[PDB]
CSV table of N, CA and C and ligand atoms in Angstrom, one decimal:
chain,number,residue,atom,x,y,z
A,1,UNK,N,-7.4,-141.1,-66.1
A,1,UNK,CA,-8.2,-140.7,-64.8
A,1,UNK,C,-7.2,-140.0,-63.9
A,2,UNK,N,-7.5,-138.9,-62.9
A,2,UNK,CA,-7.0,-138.0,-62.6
A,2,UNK,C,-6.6,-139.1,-60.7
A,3,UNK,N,-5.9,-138.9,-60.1
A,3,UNK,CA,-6.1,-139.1,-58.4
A,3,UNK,C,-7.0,-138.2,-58.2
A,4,UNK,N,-7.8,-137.7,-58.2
A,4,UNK,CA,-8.9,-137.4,-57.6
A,4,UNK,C,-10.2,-138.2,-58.0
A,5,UNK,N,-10.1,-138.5,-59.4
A,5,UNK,CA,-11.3,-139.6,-59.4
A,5,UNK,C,-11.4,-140.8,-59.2
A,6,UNK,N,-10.2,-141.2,-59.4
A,6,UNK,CA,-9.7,-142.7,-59.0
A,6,UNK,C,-9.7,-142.8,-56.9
A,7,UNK,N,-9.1,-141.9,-56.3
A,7,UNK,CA,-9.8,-141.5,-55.3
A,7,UNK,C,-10.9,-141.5,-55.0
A,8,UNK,N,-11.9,-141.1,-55.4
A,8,UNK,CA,-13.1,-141.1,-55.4
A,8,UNK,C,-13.7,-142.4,-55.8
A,9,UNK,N,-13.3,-142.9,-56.7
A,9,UNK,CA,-14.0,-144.1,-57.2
A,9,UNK,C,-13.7,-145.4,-56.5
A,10,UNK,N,-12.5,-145.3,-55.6
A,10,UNK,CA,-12.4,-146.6,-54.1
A,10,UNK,C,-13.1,-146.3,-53.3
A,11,UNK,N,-13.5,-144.8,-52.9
A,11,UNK,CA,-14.2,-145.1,-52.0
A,11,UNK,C,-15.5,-145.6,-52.2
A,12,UNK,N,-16.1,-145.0,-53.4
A,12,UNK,CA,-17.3,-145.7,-53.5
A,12,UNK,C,-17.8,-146.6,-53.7
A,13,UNK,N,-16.9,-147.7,-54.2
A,13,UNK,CA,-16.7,-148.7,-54.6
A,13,UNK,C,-16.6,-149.8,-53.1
A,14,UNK,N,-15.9,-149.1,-52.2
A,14,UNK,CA,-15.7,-149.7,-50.7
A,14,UNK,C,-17.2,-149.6,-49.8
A,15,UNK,N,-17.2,-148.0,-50.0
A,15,UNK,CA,-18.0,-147.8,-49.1
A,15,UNK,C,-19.8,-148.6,-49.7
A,16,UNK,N,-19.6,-148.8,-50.8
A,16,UNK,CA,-20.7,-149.3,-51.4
A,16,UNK,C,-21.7,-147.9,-51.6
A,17,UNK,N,-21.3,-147.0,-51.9
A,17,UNK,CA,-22.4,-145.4,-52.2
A,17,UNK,C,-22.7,-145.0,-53.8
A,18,UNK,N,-23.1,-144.5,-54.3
A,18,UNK,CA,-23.1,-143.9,-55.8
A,18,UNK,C,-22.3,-142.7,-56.0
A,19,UNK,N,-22.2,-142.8,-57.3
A,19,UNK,CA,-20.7,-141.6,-57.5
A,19,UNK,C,-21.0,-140.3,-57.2
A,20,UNK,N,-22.7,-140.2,-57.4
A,20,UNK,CA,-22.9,-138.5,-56.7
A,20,UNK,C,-23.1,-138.2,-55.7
A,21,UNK,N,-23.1,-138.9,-54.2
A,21,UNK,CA,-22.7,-138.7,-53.1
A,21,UNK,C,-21.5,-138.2,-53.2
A,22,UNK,N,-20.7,-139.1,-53.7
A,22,UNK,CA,-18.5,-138.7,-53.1
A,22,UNK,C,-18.3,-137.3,-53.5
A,23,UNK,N,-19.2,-136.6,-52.7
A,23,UNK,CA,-18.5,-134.8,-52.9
A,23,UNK,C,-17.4,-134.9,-52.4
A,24,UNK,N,-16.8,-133.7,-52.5
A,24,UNK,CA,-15.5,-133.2,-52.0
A,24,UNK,C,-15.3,-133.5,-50.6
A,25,UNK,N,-16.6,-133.0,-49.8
A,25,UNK,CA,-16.4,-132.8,-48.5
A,25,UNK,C,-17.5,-133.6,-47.6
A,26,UNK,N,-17.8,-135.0,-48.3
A,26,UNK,CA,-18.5,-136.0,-47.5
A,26,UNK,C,-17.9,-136.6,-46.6
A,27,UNK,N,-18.3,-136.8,-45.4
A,27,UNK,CA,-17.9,-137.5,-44.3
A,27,UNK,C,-18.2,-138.8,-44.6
A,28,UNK,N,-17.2,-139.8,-44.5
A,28,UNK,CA,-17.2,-141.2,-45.0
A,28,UNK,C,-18.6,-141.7,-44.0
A,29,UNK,N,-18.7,-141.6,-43.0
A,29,UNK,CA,-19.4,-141.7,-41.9
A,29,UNK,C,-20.7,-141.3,-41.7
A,30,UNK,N,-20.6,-139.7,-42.1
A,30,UNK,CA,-21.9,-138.6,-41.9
A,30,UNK,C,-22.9,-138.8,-43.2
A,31,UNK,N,-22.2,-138.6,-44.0
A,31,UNK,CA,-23.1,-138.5,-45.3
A,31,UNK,C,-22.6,-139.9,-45.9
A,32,UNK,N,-21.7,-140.4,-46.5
A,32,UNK,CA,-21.2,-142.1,-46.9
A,32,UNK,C,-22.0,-143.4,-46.7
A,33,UNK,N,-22.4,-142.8,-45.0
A,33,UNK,CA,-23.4,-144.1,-44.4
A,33,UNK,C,-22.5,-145.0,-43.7
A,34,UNK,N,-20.7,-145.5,-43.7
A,34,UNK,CA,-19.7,-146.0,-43.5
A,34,UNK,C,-19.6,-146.3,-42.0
A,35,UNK,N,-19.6,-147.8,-41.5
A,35,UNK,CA,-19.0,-148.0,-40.1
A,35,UNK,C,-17.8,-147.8,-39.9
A,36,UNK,N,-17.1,-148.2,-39.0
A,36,UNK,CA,-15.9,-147.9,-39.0
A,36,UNK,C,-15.4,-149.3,-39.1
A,37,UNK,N,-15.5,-150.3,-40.0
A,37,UNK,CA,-15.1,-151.1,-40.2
A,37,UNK,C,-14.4,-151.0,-41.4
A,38,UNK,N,-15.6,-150.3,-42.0
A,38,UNK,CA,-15.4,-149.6,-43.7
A,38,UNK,C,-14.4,-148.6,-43.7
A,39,UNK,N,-14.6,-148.3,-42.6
A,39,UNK,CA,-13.1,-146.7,-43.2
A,39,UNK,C,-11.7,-147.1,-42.6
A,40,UNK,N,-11.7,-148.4,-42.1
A,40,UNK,CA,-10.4,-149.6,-41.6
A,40,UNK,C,-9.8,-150.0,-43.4
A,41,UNK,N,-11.1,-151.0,-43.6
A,41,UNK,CA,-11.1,-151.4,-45.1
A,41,UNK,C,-10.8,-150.7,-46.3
A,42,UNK,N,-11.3,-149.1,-46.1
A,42,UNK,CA,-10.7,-148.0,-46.8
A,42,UNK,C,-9.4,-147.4,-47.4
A,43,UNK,N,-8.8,-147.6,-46.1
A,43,UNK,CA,-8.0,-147.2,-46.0
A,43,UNK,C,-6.9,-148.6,-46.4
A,44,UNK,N,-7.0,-149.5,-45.9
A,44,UNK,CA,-6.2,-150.5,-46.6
A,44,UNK,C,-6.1,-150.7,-48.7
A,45,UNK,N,-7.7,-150.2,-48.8
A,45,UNK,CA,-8.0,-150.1,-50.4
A,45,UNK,C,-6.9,-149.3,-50.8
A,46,UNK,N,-6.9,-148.1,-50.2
A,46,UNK,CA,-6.5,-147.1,-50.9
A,46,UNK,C,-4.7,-146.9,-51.0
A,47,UNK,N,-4.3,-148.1,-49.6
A,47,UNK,CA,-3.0,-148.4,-49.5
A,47,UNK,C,-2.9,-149.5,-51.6
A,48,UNK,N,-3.5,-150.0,-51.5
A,48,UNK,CA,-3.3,-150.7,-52.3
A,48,UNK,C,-3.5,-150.1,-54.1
A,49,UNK,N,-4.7,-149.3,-54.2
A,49,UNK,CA,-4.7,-148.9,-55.6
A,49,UNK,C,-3.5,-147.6,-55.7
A,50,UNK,N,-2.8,-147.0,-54.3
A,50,UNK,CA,-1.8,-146.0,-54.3
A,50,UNK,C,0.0,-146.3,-54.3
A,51,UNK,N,0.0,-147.9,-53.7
A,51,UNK,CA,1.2,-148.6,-53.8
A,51,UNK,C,1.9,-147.9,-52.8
A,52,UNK,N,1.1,-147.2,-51.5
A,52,UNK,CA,1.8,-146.7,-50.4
A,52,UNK,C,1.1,-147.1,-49.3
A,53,UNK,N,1.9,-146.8,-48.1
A,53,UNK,CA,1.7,-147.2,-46.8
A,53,UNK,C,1.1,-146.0,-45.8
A,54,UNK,N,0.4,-146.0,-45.4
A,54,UNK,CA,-0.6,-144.8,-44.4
A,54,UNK,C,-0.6,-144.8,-43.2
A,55,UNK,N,0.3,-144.3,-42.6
A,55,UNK,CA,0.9,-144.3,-41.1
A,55,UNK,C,-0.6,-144.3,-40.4
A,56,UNK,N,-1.1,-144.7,-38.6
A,56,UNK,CA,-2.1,-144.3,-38.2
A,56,UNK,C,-2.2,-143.4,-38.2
A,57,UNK,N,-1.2,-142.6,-37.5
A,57,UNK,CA,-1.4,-141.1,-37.4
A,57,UNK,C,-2.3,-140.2,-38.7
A,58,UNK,N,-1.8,-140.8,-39.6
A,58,UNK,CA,-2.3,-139.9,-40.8
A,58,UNK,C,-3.7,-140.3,-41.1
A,59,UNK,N,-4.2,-141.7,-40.8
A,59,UNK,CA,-5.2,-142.9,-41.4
A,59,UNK,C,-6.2,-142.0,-40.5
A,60,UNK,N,-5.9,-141.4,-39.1
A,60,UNK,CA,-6.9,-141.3,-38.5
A,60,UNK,C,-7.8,-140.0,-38.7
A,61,UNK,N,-6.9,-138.8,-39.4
A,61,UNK,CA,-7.3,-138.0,-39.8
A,61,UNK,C,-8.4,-138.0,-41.0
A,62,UNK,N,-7.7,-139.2,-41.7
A,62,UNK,CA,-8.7,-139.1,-43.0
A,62,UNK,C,-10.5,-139.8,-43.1
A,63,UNK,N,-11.3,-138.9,-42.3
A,63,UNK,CA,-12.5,-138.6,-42.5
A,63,UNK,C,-13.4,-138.6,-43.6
A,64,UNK,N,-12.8,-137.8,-44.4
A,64,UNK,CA,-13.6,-137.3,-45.6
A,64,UNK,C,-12.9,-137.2,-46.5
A,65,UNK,N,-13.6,-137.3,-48.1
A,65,UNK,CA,-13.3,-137.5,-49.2
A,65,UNK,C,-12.4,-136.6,-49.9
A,66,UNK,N,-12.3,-135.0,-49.1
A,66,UNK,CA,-10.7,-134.4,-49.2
A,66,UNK,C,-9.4,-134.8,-48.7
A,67,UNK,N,-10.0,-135.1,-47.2
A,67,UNK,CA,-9.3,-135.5,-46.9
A,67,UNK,C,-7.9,-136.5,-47.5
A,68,UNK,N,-8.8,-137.9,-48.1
A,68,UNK,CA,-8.0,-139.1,-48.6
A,68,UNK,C,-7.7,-138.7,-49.8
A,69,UNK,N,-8.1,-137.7,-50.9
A,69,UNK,CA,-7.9,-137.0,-52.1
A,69,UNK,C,-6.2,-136.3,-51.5
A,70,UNK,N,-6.1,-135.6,-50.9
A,70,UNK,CA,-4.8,-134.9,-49.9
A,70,UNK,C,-4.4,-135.7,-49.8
A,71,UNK,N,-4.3,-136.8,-48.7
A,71,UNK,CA,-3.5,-137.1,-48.5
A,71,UNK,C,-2.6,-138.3,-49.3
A,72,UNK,N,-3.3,-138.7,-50.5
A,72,UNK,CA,-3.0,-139.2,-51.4
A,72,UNK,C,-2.1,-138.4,-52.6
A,73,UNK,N,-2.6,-137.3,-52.6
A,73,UNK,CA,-1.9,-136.6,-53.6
A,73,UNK,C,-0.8,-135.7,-52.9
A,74,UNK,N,-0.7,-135.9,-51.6
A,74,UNK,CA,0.8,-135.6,-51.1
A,74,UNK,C,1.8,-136.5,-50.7
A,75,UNK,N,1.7,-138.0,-51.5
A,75,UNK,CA,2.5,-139.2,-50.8
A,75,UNK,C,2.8,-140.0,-52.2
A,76,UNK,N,2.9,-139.3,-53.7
A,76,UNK,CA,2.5,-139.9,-54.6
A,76,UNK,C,3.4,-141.0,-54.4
A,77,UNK,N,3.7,-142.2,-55.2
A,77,UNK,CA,4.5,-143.6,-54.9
A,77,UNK,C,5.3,-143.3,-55.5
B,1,ZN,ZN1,-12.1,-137.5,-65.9
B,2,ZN,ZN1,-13.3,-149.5,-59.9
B,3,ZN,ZN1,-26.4,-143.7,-51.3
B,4,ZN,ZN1,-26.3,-135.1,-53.4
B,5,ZN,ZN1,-25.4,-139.9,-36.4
B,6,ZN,ZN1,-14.9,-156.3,-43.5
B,7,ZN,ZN1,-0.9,-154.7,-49.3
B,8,ZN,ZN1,-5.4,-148.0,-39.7
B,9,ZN,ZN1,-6.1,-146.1,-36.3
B,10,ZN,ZN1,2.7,-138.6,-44.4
């Protein structure tokens, strides 16, 4: 499986959505359905299936499903 689908497949899996929602450029929020509790919890997920740490600064950026696809595939562990 590629970081991009395994990417894809936390969030869905977090956000509780189906796999043909997680386009490229879904807003975890807009289209996801996601509180912001969820994109808290997200982002801890994704610390964990990546084996890296996600500064705020960067955490707060990551919106959308490119978003966390980027910034994951620019931090590999
Ligand atoms: Zn594949
Ligand atoms: Zn899974
Ligand atoms: Zn749905
Ligand atoms: Zn659709
Ligand atoms: Zn609204
Ligand atoms: Zn919770
Ligand atoms: Zn941890
Ligand atoms: Zn955070
Ligand atoms: Zn924050
Ligand atoms: Zn960074």
């Amino acid at each position: 499986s590629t970081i991009e689908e395994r990417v894809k497949k936390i969030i869905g899996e977090q956000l509780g959505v189906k796999q043909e929602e997680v386009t490229n450029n879904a807003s975890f929020v807009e289209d996801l359905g996601a509180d912001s509790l969820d994109t808290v919890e997200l982002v801890m997920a994704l610390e964990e299936e990546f084996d890296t740490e996600i500064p705020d600064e960067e955490a707060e950026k990551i919106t959308t499903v490119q978003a966390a696809i980027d910034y994951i595939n620019g931090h590999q562990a």
